[PDB]
């Protein structure tokens, strides 16, 4: 534009300082650290970590299939699924790495009976949740989007979370625990 003319971003564009996305990068560089306590070794923790997508995929699908976007409301509902899924995984990997140091069992051992013990709680918890959050994946009165944006990212989540957690988590356990 003609010399002497210049520009500035204001309000809805200026915002704000500061402000970076590396928040989650320091979060994830301490969820390692926390587990390195619970599970004795530095090498183990990856067992629960690798879960995290097995959770988002379904939630993303559920949003994309309903045609609703990445809000904050979906974004928090994602974070509840990234933790609920990884909580369940924490119990599986705990029981396993205990019913082999307390009991003193073979290399594969009750990684199975770990998933056995835990399958009853993991199932009825996710049954309750998907059932309690039901009417707020349709509802459609006032907050007909607001409430509807909350459930869809959970619905799709706890669906993908549990129905893959059972399977991939002991894969993640035995793969990694052998590898070192």
């Amino acid at each position: 534009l003609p010399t002497g003319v210049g520009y500035d971003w204001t309000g809805m564009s200026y915002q704000e300082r500061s402000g970076a996305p590396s928040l989650y990068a320091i979060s994830l560089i301490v969820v390692f650290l926390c587990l390195a306590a619970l599970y004795e070794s530095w090498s183990i923790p990856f067992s629960v970590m690798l879960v995290v997508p097995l959770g988002v995929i379904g939630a993303l699908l559920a949003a994309t299939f309903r045609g609703l976007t990445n809000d904050v409301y979906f974004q928090v509902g994602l974070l509840t699924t990234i933790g609920l899924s990884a909580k369940n995984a924490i119990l599986i990997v705990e029981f396993a790495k205990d019913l082999m140091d307390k009991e003193g069992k073979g290399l594969i051992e009750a990684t199975l009976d770990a998933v056995r013990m835990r399958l009853r709680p993991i199932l009825m918890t996710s049954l309750a949740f998907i059932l309690g959050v039901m009417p707020l994946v349709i509802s459609t009165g006032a907050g007909s989007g607001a409430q509807n944006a909350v459930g869809t990212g959970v619905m799709g989540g706890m669906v993908t979370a549990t129905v893959l957690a059972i399977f991939f988590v002991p894969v993640f356990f035995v793969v990694v625990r052998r590898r070192f």
Partner: protein
């Protein structure tokens, strides 16, 4: 008391407890063939990680 999981009784939970105690087992050991050959899940991963 030890062993008990109520596999059948009066109410419609005898119907159920045998039902879940059936369902558990039919997909308890299905990790077995899975964990032996991890590979066909370990790269099914990347299909869902991407």
């Amino acid at each position: 008391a030890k062993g008990d999981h109520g596999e059948g009784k009066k109410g419609f939970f005898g119907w159920f407890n045998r039902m879940f105690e059936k369902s558990t087992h039919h997909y308890t050991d299905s990790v077995g063939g899975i964990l032996r050959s991890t590979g066909r899940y370990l790269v099914l991963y990347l299909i869902i990680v991407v």
